[PDB]
RNA sequence: AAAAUUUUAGGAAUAGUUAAUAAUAAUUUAUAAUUUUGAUUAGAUUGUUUUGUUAAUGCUAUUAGAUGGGUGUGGAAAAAUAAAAAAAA
């Protein structure tokens, strides 16, 4: 359940890549 | 020539398992251990003089 | 032809002259100084020198204007001889760090070292063509030349130290408010191509900081000019000295903003950043020791093994510091503070504005003491009739009747410090100037010397000009000095003139000479 | 407005026993763009690491030839001479069992000195030869390099080609042909032309006799006629001459 | 060496030096 | 992997702990694997890795991580330059049994890396301490290779910058000079050391014999960083801090049939 | 120059490396060598005539001394305070 904290969302958006066309 | 000094007894026997006296022989000059020991522990903060 | 130089105030250590008391000639003079001090104010100079405590007990009401007016010059005293010491002076560090205690002890150390040299080597001060010193070095040099007896010299340095402490007490900010830092533009990389332009730019920086912070109680100003291009010591409040440190930082000069614009907006952005940091809660004294040794024996949470054993800091006992201890190199929560030593902004242990506008009242109160302390004009003219004495003011030889010297001394007296800012609230008087005019009226050289020995308490010392006058016009090729720690020899050797000069320390390097 | 370094979060946790743990963790620095600090000395400058020799086989061994041929003026005579002498020294310092575990990689970090050093040296020699041969030995159309130094460089190159690594490991990522001796026919022809251009090339001295023997060996190995090492006037009037006949006729 | 250094590495939304917070800027 | 260990703040804290209390291999491997799989490495992570790399005094790992930082396009601070120059200075070197400890230093050319690191640290606007310069000079002069001209230039720079001289670099430079047969430079170094007051060379002062002329396996020693024998140093001073020349040995701190605590006494 | 006996509660890799050649090879040739029949590092302990206990196949002890070279003296390095060794009448 630790994975449902907003810190996990911050980590996810940090790990999000850049999709360039 | 100040050679009148008697032979030092700085090495001291310490008792060990079967009361065999262990003697701390002084380190020979030709090693890097004393050279490393004489330097300051923290070069940044300890005085170099 | 060699020169004699006395040390500055900073080079004070515990146990300086202890090893030099074996000579009976030194011992007799030391006993005379001890007896004079006990008769006058009853403080233990020998105790202070031998060990440096955090608190000392001194005679009752010793620190007061009543004492400074009653004692005058070599008071007979003996009224307070066995009276108990019911008042104390304390210090978080050693009690020797107090100015009113280090000045008499340091002058006594100078005198005993001079006697030791004169006895062991047959040393002759008259051999040196020019003799000079710092703020207290001048009093020591006068005593060495024989104008002032050692007892009166000790009394005078104690008096001026007490007056400096009085000025600090009168200042609303506590002792922690005053801070002293030496600035190095050459390493700070302020147009390294032209060091003279670097120095001028640093002066412009301190002027702009003072002008911008004139609206508040903060103030900074230069105190002494030691090195031509590598050292300039200033004092001031932490709020403005942090801005000065921000200005004297290539990383802040470039990364923060500008890096190509004028230097006037640098002061504004530095003070804005300093205000932001002080709002953010950055400590004002980050350079206060890395950490002490940690030893515990609770064993409730550390365990039995870790008890009574020093906690090793790092895999090699901190031989290579980690990121936490390198804040000065990589800007961190404490490194980003302006008051962090970075090899050009060097803090000094002294926390007193030695030469600043705060001590003009101290000069006014101190002038009569020197006036009564100076000896007879017959002896003074015996000294000055045609080793020349070099003055901190104007950085030139002390010629009593030199037409240019009178103008230069008046210019120095009327010349405000570079960082000094004055207004209606600030307290200043023309008493020193009128006393110097009374002396210039050629009534006596006693008044002139007593005004020139009291005008340097607040006025900055031009040590760079002192060195230039000693070397160029006086033709001094060897410039050795008598100091406990040999700090002024570095100042002599670092400057580039090319001519070559060799520096030695009489007590420390007696074997070399 | 000015860039501010991100702060480090200070967290104090009091243990149940009573041991306080203080942490300074840059959670903000873990995210967000990395703040770039422009250097005081104009643009940001960083150290290059294109000269250090490492155990990786994805690149070639960094030699002084690499930094000499990084885009300089190839027409400079002293630059050509320095490149030639560095290549000569490289060849001079230049002049192995199948291990299963090293098949899908290079030789281990500890055994770099015993297994990979020679392979790297040979690969570097071949890769530098493929770029230097047309500079040390100019094509036949005064010269930038003298005949003696060209001959010495060719002899060192031949020694390297003959002492090239013969055992081909399965870990060798390059083509197997790179482990074979070089073909220096054009280089030998150029050396012969430069030697016949100037007279008195061969002398009855011991060193010159050794040079003549080396030239004969080069011609025999690389299928280059030995007549090109002598003026055509000495060979004119004959339909064809062989290397052995040339040696037996011009042997001092 | 560049292939090994870029092995299993991809550009991030915020790791780019020219990135800004927030990523999309119109016009405890 | 569970989210608790997937959180990059846990990655940073465990990497820092690993650097504080492990060897260089642990930190290097963990950081490389983390960079390979997720775990965006920042300047803080790189500095923490360089801390352990400099502590163990290794050059190949330092150049590898510097290349990795260049690839990742991370702008470093002065701590990175300090760490890399200190690692170069602490790189191991020793002539034991006619066999050098490190044969890779000649190929690595750590002296040039140290010099360029010092130059970049000075140029970019970061503070330059005495330790970085002393480490650079140590890299320049060692029993391995002879680089005395550049060391002399660096020493002149230190002299005009009024920087402190370390006894280790003084000894290395003196040995390099006497090995390259430059007694004039050796005498100049001795005069400088005697004037400064270095512990090793406080007493050693000699007169100038070149007064009328102007300017123009071998060594058998082993040098390793402090961390290799820090445990030996600590236990030696804990046991006998009143007899420094005692040669701390077995049975002085552990009885028979019991471990002595330190694995690998005297290497 | 050999051969045999060789310790650890929870056990995995080791290395200027094997053989042939030679008064070779920092750069020869080869499908190399060590190890789960327990190797290599690490910890412990000065190795195969010594005790203690018992009726006894057992169990439990023992000592002092061989810790790299680097003008290599000497027959032999064991060569940097340490006797119960009479050493050219």
Distance of F24 CA from G40 C1′ (whole Å): 22
* Resolution reading in Å: 3.7
Give residues with Cβ within 8 angstroms of C184, minimum separation 6. Answer: C230, C231, C232, C343, C344, C345, C346
For strand G, the positions having any atom within 7 A of a protein Cβ are 15-18, 26-32, 41-46, 63-64, 68-70, 81
Nearest residue for G70, CA–C1': F220
**The token pair that represents C242 in the structure block:** 């942090």
Question: For F261, how many CA atoms within 13 A lie in the half-sphere containing its CB?
Answer: 13
Judge: A8–F40 Cβ closer than 8 Å, yes or no. Answer: no
The answer to whether the beta carbons of residues D155 and D191 sit under 8 Å apart is no
Distance, in Å, from the CA atom of F129 to the CA atom of F118, rounded to the nearest integer, reads 10
| Residue F25: C-alpha distances to residues C387, F21, F33, F229 (Å) | 69, 12, 12, 18
How many Å lie between the alpha carbon of A17 and the closest alpha carbon of chain D?
Answer: 13
The token pair at A14 is 């940090």
C164 contacts: CB under 8 Å, gap ≥ 6 = C99, C100, C352, C354, C359, C362, C457
For chain E, breaks with the C atom over 2.5 A from the next N come after: 27
Q: Which residue of B has its CA nearest to F237?
A: B37
Per the structure, the residue whose CA is closest to nucleotide G27 at C1' is: D95
Check CB contact under 8 Å for E17 and D59: no
Spanning CA of D148 to C1' of G34, the rounded length in angstroms is 52
B41: chain C residues, CB-CB within 8 Å: 317-319
**Cβ contact, residue pair E1, D31, below 8 Å:** no
CB F225 within 8 Å of CB F267: no
Structure tokens given for A13: 């958006």
CA distance C64 to C70: 10
Instruction: Give the angle F67-F69-F72 at the CA atoms, nearest 5°.
Output: 110
Nearest CA in chain A to E15: A14
Q: What is the pairing mode between strands F93-96 and F222-223? A: antiparallel
Tokens in use for F120? 């970049």
User: Any residues with CB less than 8 A from the CB of C456 and at least 6 apart, and which?
Assistant: C135, C138, C355, C391, C392, C393
Pairing assessment for the beta strands C232-236 and C179-183 based on DSSP bridges: antiparallel
**Residue listed under structure tokens 């005579």:** D77
Going across the sheet that includes F99-100, the strands are F99-100, F93-96, F222-223
Query: What was the structure determination method?
Result: cryo-EM
Nearest nucleotide relative to F259: CA against C1': G43
Answer positive or negative: Cα dihedral of D96, D100, D105, D107. negative
Alpha carbon distance F42, C81 (integer Å): 71
Peptide bond into E22 cis (omega under 30): yes
The answer on whether D110 is annotated among ligand-binding residues is: yes
Question: CA C287, C289, C294 angle in degrees (round to 5)?
Answer: 150
CA neighbor of C317 nearest in space, from B39, F254, F244, F89: B39
Contact assessment for residue F175 and residue F214, using Cβ atoms and an 8 Å cutoff = no
Q: Are A and E neighbours with ≥3 CB pairs closer than 8 A? A: yes
Q: How far is CA D158 from CA D45, D164, D219, D246, in A?
A: 42, 10, 11, 22
Q: Can you say whether the dihedral through the CA atoms of F147, F149, F155, F158 is positive or negative? A: negative
Helices of type H across C171-234: 185-188, 195-212
Give the one of F2, F3, F38 whose C-beta lies nearest to A15's C-beta.
Answer: F38
Q: How far is CA C278 from CA C244, C275, C329, C341, C400, in A?
A: 15, 5, 21, 18, 51
Task: Give the dihedral of Cα atoms E20, E5, F87, D25; nearest 10 deg.
Answer: 40
Going along D184-236, which residue ranges are E strands?
none
- Any chains having at least 3 CB pairs less than 8 A from chain C are B, D, F
Give the single-character DSSP code of D179. G
The backbone torsions φ and ψ at residue D13, rounded to the nearest 5 degrees and listed phi first, read -115, 125
Cβ distance D51 to D43 under 8 Å? no
User: How do beta strands D20-25 and D9-14 pair?
Assistant: antiparallel
Exposed, middle or buried, D10 (CB in 10 Å: 0-12/13-18/19+)?
Answer: exposed
Q: Which residue from C317, C321, C325 is facing B41, i.e. has the nearest CB?
A: C317
Burial (CB count within 10 angstroms: exposed 0-12, middle 13-18, buried 19+), residue D130: exposed
B24 touches F246 (CB < 8 A): yes
Contacts 24+ apart (CB under 8 A), C202-207: C202/C232, C202/C248, C203/C418, C204/C263, C205/C244, C205/C247, C205/C248, C205/C263, C205/C266, C205/C267, C206/C234, C206/C244, C206/C418, C206/C419, C207/C418, C207/C419
Q: Is the sign of the CA dihedral C443, C445, C447, C452 positive or negative?
A: positive
Q: D165 burial class (0-12, 13-18, 19+ CB within 10 angstroms)?
A: middle
Q: How many Å from the CA of F228 to C1' of G73?
A: 39
Count of residues for chain A? 21
User: Considering only CA atoms, which of F69, F70, F53, F51 is closest in space to residue F61?
Assistant: F53
First to last CA, chain E: 43
Which residues of F carry a binding-site annotation?
Answer: 32, 102
Interface C-D, measured as beta-carbon pairs within 8 A, has a size of: 37
β-partners of residue F100 are F95
Comparing C-alpha atoms, which of C188, C463, C423, C464 is closest to residue C206? Answer: C188
Stated in angstroms, how far is D129 CA from G19 C1'? 37
In order, the DSSP letters of D31-78 are SSPPPP---SSSS------SS---S-SSS----HHHHHTSS--TT-HH
- The Cα–Cα gap between F193 and F202 comes to 7
Which tokens hold the place of D165? Answer: 């690594």
Beta bridge partners of C131: C4, C389
The answer for C166, left when phi > 0, alpha when psi is -120 to 50, beta otherwise, is alpha
Length reported for chain C: 513
* CB of D2 less than 8 A from some CB of C: yes
Residues, CB < 7 Å to strand G: B 7, 11, 18, 20, 23, 30; D 93-99, 110-111, 113-114, 117-118, 163, 166-167; F 95-99, 103, 217, 220, 250-251, 254-260, 262-265
Q: Give the mutation candidate from B36, B39, B44, B47 for the C interface (greatest C CB count, under 10 A).
A: B44
CB contact under 8 A, A14 and E14: yes
Residues of C in contact with B43 (CB under 8 A): 319
> Which of A18, A19, A21 is the best residue to mutate to test the E interface, defined by the most E CB atoms within 10 Å of its own CB?
A18
Question: Beta-carbon neighbour count of residue F234 at 10 Å?
Answer: 17
> If 0-12 CB within 10 Å is exposed, 13-18 middle and 19+ buried, where does residue C200 land?
middle
Q: Which of F37, F38, F59 is nearest to F103 (CA)?
A: F59
Q: Which residues of F206-221 are buried (b: 16+ CB within 10 A; e: fewer)?
A: eeeeeeeeeeeeeeeb
DSSP state of C507: T
Give the position of tokens 């470093």. F76
Residue C437, exposed/middle/buried by CB under 10 A (0-12, 13-18, 19+)? middle
Rounded-to-integer distance, Cα F125 and Cα F131, Å = 17
The Cα C353–Cα D167 span in angstroms is: 80
Contact status, residue D121 vs residue D130, Cβ threshold 8 Å: no
Q: How far is C-alpha D224 from the chain's CA centre? A: 25
Rounded to 5 degrees, φ, ψ at D12 are: -110, 120
Q: Give the neighbor-by-neighbor strand order of the sheet with C388-389.
A: C388-389, C130-132, C2-6, C478-482
CA end-to-end distance (rounded Å), chain F:
38
Residue D182 has phi, psi (to 5 degrees) of -75, 160
Half-sphere CA count of C129, side-chain side, radius 13 A: 13
Please state the separation of Cα C449 from the chain's center in Å.
21
Neighbours of C304 (CB within 10 A): 8
Q: What residue in C sits closest to D2 (Cα-Cα)?
A: C256
Alpha-carbon distance values, C44 to C31, C47, C56, C188, C483 (Å): 12, 5, 9, 44, 22
CA C275 to chain centre: 30
* Lookup: nucleotide whose C1' is closest to F101 CA: G16
């Amino acid at each position: 359940a630790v994975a449902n904290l907003p810190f996990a969302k911050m980590i996810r958006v940090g790990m999000l890549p850049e999709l360039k066309s | 020539a100040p050679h009148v000094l008697e032979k030092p007894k700085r090495v001291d026997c310490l008792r060990i398992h079967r009361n065999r006296p262990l003697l701390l022989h002084p380190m020979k000059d030709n090693n890097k251990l004393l050279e490393l020991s004489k330097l300051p522990a923290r070069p940044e903060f300890d005085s170099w003089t | 032809q060699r020169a004699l130089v006395f040390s500055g105030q900073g080079a004070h250590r515990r146990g300086m002259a202890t090893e030099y008391l074996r000579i009976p000639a030194v011992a007799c003079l030391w006993e005379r100084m001890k007896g004079s001090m006990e008769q006058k104010y009853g403080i233990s100079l020998q105790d202070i020198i031998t060990e440096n405590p955090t608190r000392l007990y001194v005679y009752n009401d010793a620190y007061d204007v009543a004492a400074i007016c009653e004692r005058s010059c070599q008071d007979g005293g003996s009224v307070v001889e066995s009276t108990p010491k019911q008042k104390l002076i304390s210090h978080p560090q050693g009690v020797l760090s107090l100015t009113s205690l280090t000045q008499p002890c340091m002058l006594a150390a100078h005198m005993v070292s001079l006697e030791y040299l004169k006895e062991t080597r047959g040393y002759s001060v008259e051999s040196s063509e020019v003799i000079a010193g710092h703020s207290l070095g001048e009093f020591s040099a006068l005593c060495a030349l024989g104008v002032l007896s050692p007892e009166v010299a000790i009394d005078l340095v104690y008096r001026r130290g007490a007056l400096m402490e009085d000025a600090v007490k009168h200042s609303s900010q506590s002792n922690e408010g005053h801070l002293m830092f030496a600035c190095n533009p050459q390493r700070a990389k302020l147009c390294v191509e032209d060091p003279d332009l670097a120095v001028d730019q640093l002066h412009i920086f301190v002027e702009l900081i003072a002008r911008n912070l004139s609206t508040t109680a903060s103030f900074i100003e230069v105190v002494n000019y030691n090195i031509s291009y590598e050292q300039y010591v200033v004092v001031g409040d932490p709020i403005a000295l942090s801005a000065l440190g921000k200005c004297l930082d290539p990383q802040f000069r470039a990364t923060s903003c500008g890096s190509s614009a004028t230097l006037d907006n640098i002061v504004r952005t530095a003070v804005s950043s300093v205000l932001q940091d002080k709002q953010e809660g950055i400590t004002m004294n980050p350079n206060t020791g890395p950490a002490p040794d940690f030893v515990t024996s609770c064993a409730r949470k550390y365990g039995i093994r870790s008890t009574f054993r020093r906690f090793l800091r790092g895999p090699d006992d901190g031989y290579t510091p980690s990121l936490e201890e390198l804040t000065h190199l990589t800007l961190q929560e404490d490194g980003r503070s302006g008051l962090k030593k970075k090899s050009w902004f060097i803090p000094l242990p002294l926390s007193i504005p030695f030469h600043s506008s705060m001590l003009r009242r101290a000069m006014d109160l101190f002038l009569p003491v020197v006036r009564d302390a100076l000896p007879d004009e017959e002896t003074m003219r015996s000294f000055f009739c045609i080793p020349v004495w070099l003055t901190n003011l104007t950085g030139t030889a002390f010629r009593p009747f030199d037409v240019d010297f009178q103008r230069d001394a008046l210019d120095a007296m009327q010349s405000m410090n570079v960082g000094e800012i004055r207004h209606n609230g600030r307290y200043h008087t023309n008493l020193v100037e009128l006393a110097f005019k009374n002396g210039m009226d050629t009534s006596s050289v006693r008044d002139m010397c007593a005004a020139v020995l009291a005008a340097q308490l607040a006025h900055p010392v031009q040590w760079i000009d002192v060195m230039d006058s000693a070397v160029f016009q006086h033709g001094v090729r060897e410039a050795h000095e008598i100091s406990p720690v040999r700090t002024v020899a570095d100042m002599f050797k670092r400057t580039v003139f090319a001519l070559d000069i060799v520096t030695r320390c009489l007590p420390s390097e007696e074997r070399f000479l | 407005v000015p860039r501010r370094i991100p702060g480090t979060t200070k967290v104090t946790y009091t243990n149940k026993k009573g041991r306080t743990f203080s942490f300074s963790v840059p959670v903000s620095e873990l995210t967000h763009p990395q703040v770039t600090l422009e250097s005081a000395a104009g643009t940001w400058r960083e150290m290059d690491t294109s000269f250090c020799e490492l155990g990786d086989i994805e690149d070639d061994m960094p030699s002084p030839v690499d930094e000499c041929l990084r885009g300089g003026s190839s027409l400079d005579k002293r630059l050509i001479q320095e490149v030639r002498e560095r290549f000569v020294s490289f060849c001079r310092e230049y002049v192995s069992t199948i291990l299963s575990t090293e098949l899908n990689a290079g030789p281990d970090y500890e055994h770099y000195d015993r297994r990979l050093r020679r392979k790297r040296h040979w690969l570097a020699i071949r890769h530098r030869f493929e770029d230097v041969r047309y500079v040390i030995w100019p094509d036949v159309v005064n010269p930038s390099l003298t005949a003696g130094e060209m001959l010495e460089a060719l002899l060192w190159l031949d020694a390297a080609s003959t002492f090239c690594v013969r055992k081909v490991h399965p870990s060798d990522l390059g083509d197997k042909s790179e482990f074979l001796p070089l073909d220096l026919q054009r280089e030998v022809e150029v050396v012969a032309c430069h030697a016949r251009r100037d007279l008195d090339f061969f002398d009855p001295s011991a060193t010159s006799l050794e040079q003549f023997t080396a030239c004969a060996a080069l011609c025999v190995n690389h299928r280059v006629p030995f007549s090109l090492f002598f003026p055509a006037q000495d060979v004119c009037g004959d339909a064809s001459v062989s290397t052995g006949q040339c040696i037996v006729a011009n042997a001092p | 060496s560049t292939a090994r250094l870029r092995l299993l590495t991809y550009p991030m939304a915020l790791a780019q030096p020219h990135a800004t917070v927030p990523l999309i800027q119109p016009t405890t | 992997t569970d989210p608790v260990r997937r959180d990059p703040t846990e990655f940073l804290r465990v990497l820092r702990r690993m650097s504080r209390t492990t060897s260089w291999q642990k930190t290097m491997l963990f950081a490389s694997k983390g960079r390979m799989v997720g775990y965006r490495l920042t300047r803080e992570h790189y500095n923490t890795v360089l801390f352990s790399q400099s502590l163990w005094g290794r050059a190949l790992e330092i150049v590898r991580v510097v290349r990795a930082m260049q690839e990742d396009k991370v702008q470093p601070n002065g701590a990175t330059y300090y760490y890399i120059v200190n690692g170069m200075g602490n790189a191991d070197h020793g002539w034991n049994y006619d066999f050098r400890i490190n044969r890779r230093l000649e190929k690595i050319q750590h002296w040039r890396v140290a010099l360029e690191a010092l130059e970049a640290c000075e140029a970019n606007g970061f503070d330059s301490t005495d330790t970085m310069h002393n480490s650079a000079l140590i890299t320049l002069v060692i029993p391995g290779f002879n680089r005395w001209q550049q060391a002399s230039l660096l020493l002149q720079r230190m002299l005009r910058e009024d920087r402190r001289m370390h006894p280790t670099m003084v000894k290395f430079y003196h040995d390099c000079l006497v090995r390259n047969n430059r007694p004039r430079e050796a005498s100049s170094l001795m005069r400088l050391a005697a004037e400064r007051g270095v512990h090793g060379y406080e007493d050693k002062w000699e007169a100038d014999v070149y007064k009328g002329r102007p300017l123009d396996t071998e060594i058998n020693s082993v040098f390793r960083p402090r961390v290799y024998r820090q445990l030996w140093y600590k236990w030696q001073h804990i046991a006998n801090r009143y007899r420094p020349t005692a040669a701390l040995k077995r049975r002085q701190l552990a009885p028979r049939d019991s471990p002595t605590g330190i694995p690998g006494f005297y290497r």
